[PDB]
Amino acid sequence: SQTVDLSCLSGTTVRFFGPSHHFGGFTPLYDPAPDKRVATVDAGANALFIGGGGLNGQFAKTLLEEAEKHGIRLTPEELSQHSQRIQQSLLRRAVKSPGKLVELDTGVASPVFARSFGFVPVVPGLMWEESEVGPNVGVTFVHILKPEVTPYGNLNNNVMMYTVAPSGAAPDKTYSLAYKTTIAGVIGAAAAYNDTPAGQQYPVQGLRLPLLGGGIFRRNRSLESIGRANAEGTSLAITRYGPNFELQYMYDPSNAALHGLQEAESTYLASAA
């Protein structure tokens, strides 16, 4: 990988991953010997389950494999239904206190989650058409994982996030608004989490991100337009919340997130001329 500080993100450290040793080069969600706590952001489904294909399926696999090692009986179907129930409940609570981090009651049982939070920057569907961007867009969840499903048994791998990105089929104007809102929810939820009691003990020191909306959600939208939305949304979210953590972009052979940030960086260099 290559790591640089971006002036257009107020000096935030960004790590751009190259191809991994794995088939297809995909970046692992969690590392075997991390020296800081990097929360990886699931490109979630509108229906809020952990499962299915792509990156969301890789999160399911990671959690299911750790559970199996610990002798926890947890099927993919149980994980899908459970994570959906938890996150539906968090979404309901978050919509009732929009723009605030909300926490699920600690009395709720979970085989995977020790503590769970939700955040909507604005009520989904209030400022855009759900028929265009899709349901539940902009919600981000933060989960502290139970030790028994924490990758490598390493405490620095005990936080995941889960975010619902807009559909690429939406018109440009509303897509840009929904996308910027979504990135605000990602950075804002993590920054807010770091101001909770749980976050004092387990601070998030980096985010590991895909290009959100860049998989099956993009439909016929160009990766270029999505990289531009990500660069603008990330710049704005960092201006709002001033997070201390670094950003990492998982390997993408299109380099779409990278290209969006490169364009914004050069523009920033020229902003006084």
Return residues touching Br ion (CB under 5 A): 20-21, 31-33, 43, 46-47, 51, 76-77, 80, 98, 121-125, 130, 135, 176, 181, 184, 191, 194, 196-198, 215, 217, 229, 232, 243-244
Q: Is the dihedral of CA 161, 166, 168, 174 positive or negative?
A: negative
Instruction: Choose among Br ion, Na ion, none what residue 243 binds, the Cβ cut-off being 5 to 8 Å by kind.
Output: Br ion
Of 18-26, 48-56, 197-205, 221-229, the window that binds Na ion (rule: CB under 5 A) is 48-56
- Name which position in 101, 184, 212, 238 contacts Na ion (CB under 5 A): 212
Distance CA 32, CA 94 (A): 33
For the bound state, the minimum distance from the C-beta of residue 90 to Br ion, rounded and expressed in Å, comes to: 14
Of 36-44, 139-147, 182-190, 256-264, the window that binds Na ion (rule: CB under 5 A) is 36-44
Distance CA 110, CA 3 (A): 36
DSSP state for residue 192 in the 8-state scheme: H
- Nearer to Br ion (CB atom), residue 62 or residue 273: 62
Distance CA 200, CA 196 (A): 6
Q: Tell me if 152 sits within 8 A of 122, measured CB to CB.
A: no
Total site size for Na ion, rule CB under 5 A: 10
DSSP state for residue 138 in the 8-state scheme: T
Please state the separation of Cα 129 from the chain's center in Å: 22
Residues lying near Na ion in the complex (CB under 5 A) are found at 43, 46-47, 51-52, 76, 165, 212-213, 217
